[PDB]
Write a protein that binds this ligand. Sequence first.
Ligand SMILES: Nc1ncnc2c1ncn2[C@@H]1O[C@H](COP(=O)(O)OP(=O)(O)O)[C@@H](O)[C@H]1O
Ligand SMILES: COc1cc(N2CC[C@@]3(O)C(=O)c4cc(C)c(C)cc4N=C23)ccn1
Ligand code: VO4
Ligand SMILES: [Cl-]
Ligand SMILES: [Mg+2]
Length: 713
Amino acid sequence: AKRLVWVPSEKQGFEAASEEKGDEVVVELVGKDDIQKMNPPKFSKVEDMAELTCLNEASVLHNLRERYFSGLIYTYSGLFCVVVNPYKHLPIYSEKIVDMYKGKKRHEMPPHIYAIADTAYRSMLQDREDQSILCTGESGAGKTENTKKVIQYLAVVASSGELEKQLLQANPILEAFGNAKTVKNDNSSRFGKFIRINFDVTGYIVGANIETYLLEKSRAIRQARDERTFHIFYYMIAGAKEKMRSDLLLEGFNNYTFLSNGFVPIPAAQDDEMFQETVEAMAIMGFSEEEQLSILKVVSSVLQLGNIVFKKERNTDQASMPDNTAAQKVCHLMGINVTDFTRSILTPRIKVGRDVVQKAQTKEQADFAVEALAKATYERLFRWILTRVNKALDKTHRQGASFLGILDIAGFEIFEVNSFEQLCINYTNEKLQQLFNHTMFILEQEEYQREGIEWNFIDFGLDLQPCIELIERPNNPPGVLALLDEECWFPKATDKSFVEKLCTEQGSHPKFQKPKQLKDKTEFSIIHYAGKVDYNASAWLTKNMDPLNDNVTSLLNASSDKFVADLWKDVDRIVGLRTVGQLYKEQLGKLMTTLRNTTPNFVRCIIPNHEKRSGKLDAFLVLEQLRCNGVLEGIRICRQGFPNRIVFQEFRQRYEILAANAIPKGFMDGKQACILMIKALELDPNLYRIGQSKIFFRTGVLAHLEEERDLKI
Ligand SMILES: Nc1ncnc2c1ncn2[C@@H]1O[C@H](COP(=O)(O)OP(=O)(O)O)[C@@H](O)[C@H]1O
Ligand SMILES: COc1cc(N2CC[C@@]3(O)C(=O)c4cc(C)c(C)cc4N=C23)ccn1
Ligand code: VO4
Ligand SMILES: [Cl-]
Ligand SMILES: [Mg+2]
């Protein structure tokens, strides 16, 4: 105790330092409000930050930093956990470490993703409540990496092994077709998922189901500078052997228009060797060599669609296709006639009342039509692959009693240009952050009032209802998505008119910022929980409607290739000659209903730096993430409230060994038996509250009782 307090810093965020002259203080190694109390050295690299005597931004930052540079990425923060991305493969995920954490309690072992998975797994069997592990974080924080380690741990711990083999190959297959290199993450998930692991009444895994959300299908046709399209396009071009190469009609990386930057490498993996890992993974799942070839022919046909060149002819508006080489390759792979495809793409027949008539197509209309067919073809392939992955994983005939779900969405992201995909991705993170706020501060305090314990409501200031109403509200007033749907059903509506209606209807909203007169109603900003994001509404009406050339879809429906005809079997919900925003809300509502019927376990992934480097912790980036995530407030509710709850029967059964001669023989009311035990144990009254059906305890109190229970042998 040498008067050491945290002083705000500009290089390392906060720095420690050792007279009080009025409303100011002098440090040496400043305002009175600027100083923050420093914890004593006994809390060096503490496992749970709720144990810290002085809870403040500087103490949480320092404890994460001291642990990070000691190869310790996991740190408990009360009920939830925090994990900083190491950007280095650490030796903390071996089968020996899976064995060490097997059946262990949170306090019995150091913080780890295996202990989070085991704690939820035991709560599922003890409380008979479905569990869910929800990984939060911005792009590249480590949500997918932690999701896969939960699966790896549960497959070993909850087993008697073909199901475990197939479950471990589910993410490698989906990542080949759904992941891509972006400027933020080299293996960025361009699709969200909720992996449901089913268990029998005893507790062993019987099956699994993966529910994916909107795929970023627009990535298959165009990519920004330094970014790659979906991984499989590179795996196929680099790894396809001599014979398969001729069957797929492949060329080099510089011979495809849909590959905007040609070949772009990933430092961690070779594309030719990743093709063999994907082929081996698909073989484990049950895909035959003929089905894998069919899959790769569709991937190749997506690329060949991009090489179709249309020319705007002089003296006429109708477009021409002088070189039909790309179209011939497309039709050979897709199993359709070339003459039919060419006349369908250039001069389709549109319904103009009850009959159809041939309507002309300009170069812009024909190029748009080809681009939208490639996006739809790729989305249907990814949907078919997932349907077969789920058919293999949920193949069992055993009765599932409970489930443990893991949510792995695409994280928050701010690119140079943010389109409709980025809005829905960032909004999902806004809803997931509000689910954390609702669980930690609203449902926690409602449970205290429900059990009749003396409690005063504390307002932690974390609530994102204005942004939720701004985007998702359907009526009174209509939100961004509702206004986008309304504009699509107008005849002469443009992307410029949508932003103009957005500015008149939601202009004065506190989380909406109108564009400056420099941008001609092209962009608009939204103040998200993480930060302000500028959205360019170019092509949003066409992206929301998703129109398809019904003539070309009719040919693909009646294709000679059975695999292509299977992808284009459902052609009834095709608008052309429900919107994506409407499908987004129905997918989001279904996930929220499912999560409300589960006990969530939050894993907050924190990104250390924007350079993808190991041994670098940008203090202000970490501080900003802890503020928008609500880590400090979430630890505060654990310290100020009673995080651990236990019913009278489980308290009496589990801790009667510590007060054996306290309860008399025979029948005794559960509530009264616990009062008799607490009097014998001599516990401080501030450490607990007796409710109507259960006893509430302060942080670490129930952990001390479990440690004392071990002494009795
Ligand atoms: N626990 C970890 N151990 C090692 N590398 C990691 C870990 N978490 C993340 N990474 C690295 O950071 C990258 C981004 O993490 P990822 O889980 O893909 O992010 P996201 O949050 O977007 O799902 C990974 O591909 C990997 O290279
Ligand atoms: C127009 O909206 C888009 C959204 C896209 N994405 C990509 C990742 C994504 O599947 C994801 O995390 C997500 C998660 C949930 C729970 C939902 C409901 C949607 C989601 N939308 C997603 C892609 C293309 N257009
Ligand atoms: O980089 V992400 O996997 O969060 O989209
Ligand atoms: Cl939690
Ligand atoms: Mg991911």
